[model samples]
Target: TPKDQEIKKLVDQNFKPLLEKYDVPGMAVGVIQNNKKYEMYYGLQSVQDKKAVNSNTIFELGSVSKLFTATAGGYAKNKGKISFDDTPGKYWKELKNTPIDQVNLLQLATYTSGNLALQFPDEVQTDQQVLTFFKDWKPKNPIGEYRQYSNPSIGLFGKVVALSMNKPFDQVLEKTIFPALGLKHSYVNVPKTQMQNYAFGYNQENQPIRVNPGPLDAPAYGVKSTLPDMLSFIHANLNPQKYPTDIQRAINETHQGRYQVNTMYQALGWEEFSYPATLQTLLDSNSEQIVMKPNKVTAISKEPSVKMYHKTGSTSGFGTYVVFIPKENIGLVMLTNKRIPNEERIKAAYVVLNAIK
Candidate 1:
């Protein structure tokens, strides 16, 4: 009872203030410590319908979907269907002999693909167009020189992984990856029967909005799930030993730090920090300057280390944040219907974790 009361106090102290600061119609917060789960819900699912936020409400994961895509690559790698050292030209012939062929799949998955734009060009929509764009692509920066956070980079990473596995991207996720992760409700396309459980994301203008389908959308920023399912997914990340052999191997690879910029270690899909990290350090690492521009990175040596892995995601209406320390056996998830500043989301979650630690 005391632990419950303390958690309530922590929520009241940290999260309650966040709702007041933003126009969040509904929000869900979940925490896992020592393999135990705790959840707290607040406000209405929407102001118009007055539906209460509950365990089943679905929210868009935004770029958090990248984690699944990267995990799929790991899965394919273990199955001998894909290799990090392979180039795009190996899977798609159109890219052969082009500048894009020089960049490896690992570089694409890690945001180090010679400075691909954050999104594909406006004219590049169809699959054929995407290939044509890559075929004619030229690198302004040297390949593998800097980390440029871009959707097309990781999107293509997902596409290549699927190509290697000989399946469509969503098929791999829905049939193999999600099921392997023991995530029951996560989906690239939410079903009609569950539509009522999906919360409407309210934009800054107080309009309900959903993610619009576009080029590489599924692999880039297109997974929807509830708080419970996401916590289970986080738990899978924390405790990989419980999974099958290939899955355990796949999940483990995603955690390895491949590159570093300042205090942040860029893991395959998630960004990481050494444990006992300070709030200011996290804010600095997740800042716009770090995310928006290409920053030169140093390769992390293959050595043993502890890390705090984290990711922030946003759609037009939803804001999501996930963080966990594997060594500490602690994790946290924040979901809201209204899109808010990533700094505020990160700071609010940090407050709770700091108090608990």
Candidate 2:
């Protein structure tokens, strides 16, 4: 009872003012430590409707879905269904002459293929259009040499993984990965059956908005989940024994850092760094920029002693941040209906984690 009261007090004292200052409408946070789970909710799902965000509310995961795409690839790879070194051209022949042909599965997942356009080139729209863009594409930096974040890189990586499994990416996730991990409320495409629980996201204009559908949308930013589901995902990452053998393997493989970029280590769907990490470095990594041309690359360590692994996702209306410390067996997930700065998310999360640790 005292612990609950203490966290409530800390949350009100430390976070309430920040939430107000930022004008965030609503947020739900999940924390797991000491083999126990706790959840905290704040603000409203819709300030207009005055609906408080609750456990049943669903929020988009944004690029954090990259973890799912990478995990799907990991699942497929472990079963001999795919390989990280394998190039996408093997499955998507349209890529044969494109710069992407030279890129391998790992390269795409790790953001090291130098494909840094945040979204597809503005001119590209349809799935075929995307394939054409890559087919005509040229890389400013060599594959495996730099980390230039791009949706097309991992978006296509997810497609190749699906092709390898003889299934669509969403179907593969719903049928294989979701069920494998026993996630009750996570989906790339929310079904009509679950619509009642979906939370509306609001933009800067306070207009309700949802992530627009796109080619292989799930691979880039299509996951919608409730607080319980995300925390379950976080918990499973903490202890793979929380899942079946296949899922455990997938989590382990996906977490392996494939390359080093500046002070950051690149894992499958998340960036990582050793413990005793400086918040300053973490903030710099996600600094607002017009474009990150090419990030320096270092050797891909088999397994670095990573202290923290984190990923951030924000759409027009929603923002998400997830972080985990394997050594401490603690993790956090923050989902909001309104966009919040990454620096703010990292600060709030680190404060809570540091206080309890």
Candidate 3:
């Protein structure tokens, strides 16, 4: 257990300095490698009460929920309820006879739908307005030309997939997706009954914040879950056979790199890059700015090899990141009450992941 003790020591020595440097209030982290586990909670929930964050504390999952939604799309596939070649117009008919008609459900879920704007316009303050915006929307580039990360792209992907199945998106995610995956506490719509476990997040100014209801809502950044459940989710990603039948099939589909943009390969909601990869190459491929722009579309041949899959999520009050390599069967999930910087969080988790050997 020397490696376990060493990781624990490294965390103790390093976690505090990063919290102080970033001015983040608190963070919970979990690590899994070769089926062994190591994890801990650090710092206060907030400066106000200094509430201790525990392994079971519920934190907003932010856009990382996209992965969950994208998985639902795959589940829809397993049930033969949808098609990758089908235009989203099947659910939102207004998309037909337009540029968006060139885009398919598969492209949207993979973020290659000609850079769909991130969300409904500001004037889109109502539900009807959201529908109207999409109906009036047009694509700027050819489908599969670029991978631009956005909420509407993945959110609506889940929406249409769920609607096509004649089920509420949030309900399917809660009752089917989360539970089927062995997630004890993950939610697109956090219930009143679980309020006691919800850890309040702190904004940049040290003000308290909770997720706001919005157009994208559950389909985008609505899920919140405990550290344990998310770590469990990552483990299942390492070895899908451990989960339910459809859930495993769904996870497998999400890993299929459907499109490539620059250095990153788009795999449903997960971003994948070839293995034997370095941290610098990863940062180059995944930096926020690089992702916003485009990179060379790269091909990953898992070829009995492995690839790294990752996603980052943020709300005004919280930051989330998950990354793993199936070949190594290693991953780490970090949840914090402040918007942790990409470099800092990724660097921190990489340490734990890289040390697994």
Candidate 4:
């Protein structure tokens, strides 16, 4: 098992310094290369109790939850319950004639609904308030004209998907999508039985914190799962041909890159790059500047070629990063209780992936 040894060595060499430098409380690193699994855990889940993180420990995914939401939308699309071309006004009459009414679901799912902000306005909290905000909101550019990451865009997309399905958002995920993908431990609301295994995320001051519930939280950034479940999800993404017809189609649909923002091709829920990509390119693509400002995107006319897909997510307390290259049959997930810089997360991930690739 020298290969396993090399995996551990690479992980230790790359991540040990990361943990020490960031003072991360707990982390679970999982890598899949050549279809073999390598999982490594480190640090304390709860420093007060000296609980070490294990494979079973659950960590909040932050915006990484968008992947599941987008997958659910795809699943609905494949089932004929929804269409990405559909406008918001079709589902909610209240939104009819509003600024976002003409915005299609595809634009929302891809963060290109004419520059939706990273988060909703501070005063917009309740469901009614969010609807009002949307009703009064004006797009900076025409729909599908620019890329700016926002929770409300995809949050409303999830809501529209649920409306099309005639079910609540989390119900669709819990009863249908999760089961369809064979995920047993991922949940929007972690169950009481699993509470004992959930890790406590530490903030900058090292105080324990978790996500605060918001009206759009369920569809936007409200998924908690263990390393094994996430690795399994990645496995399904890497090998979609092995899943059921509907789920397989859904998985494939999410990988379609429809818009190009510089070197990054914005896929349904994930960001993509052509393979053999460099660390600097990946870092620049995921930089805060890119997300803070609007970026013009050209429509991608070519079909999706071999590419490396990645997404980074964080809350006030936790950080999550995922990268997978289907062409290479490689995937990696890094989950930590301490929220660290995106550069640190991307750098650590690139180090291991570069070694394996």
lDDT of each: 0.87, 0.81, 0.79, 0.88
List the candidates' TM-scores in order: 0.96, 0.94, 0.93, 0.96
- Model 2 pairs whose backbones collide: none
- Lowest lDDT 10-mer window, candidate 3? 295-304
lDDT of 2: 0.81
lDDT computed for candidate 1: 0.87
Ranked by TM-score, the better of candidates 1 and 3 is 1
Residues forming the 10-long window of minimal summed lDDT in candidate 4? 297-306
Please say which candidate is ahead in TM-score: 1 or 2.
Answer: 1
Candidate 3 local lDDT, 47-109, one digit each (tens) = 576678887688998988988988888889888888888888887676666667678888778
The count of backbone overlaps in candidate 2 is 0
The better-scoring model by TM-score among 3 and 4 is: 4
CA RMSD per model (angstroms): 1.5, 2.0, 2.1, 1.4
User: Model 4: clashing residue pairs?
Assistant: none
lDDT ranking from best candidate downward? 4, 1, 2, 3
- Residues 56-103 of candidate 1 have per-residue lDDT tens digits of 989898989998998999999999998899999889877888888889
lDDT of candidate model 3 versus the reference: 0.79
The pairs that clash in candidate 3 are: 262-295, 262-296
The superposed Cα distance between candidate 4 and the true structure at residue 266, in angstroms, equals: 0.2
Cand. 3 TM to true fold: 0.93
lDDT of 3 at 301: 45
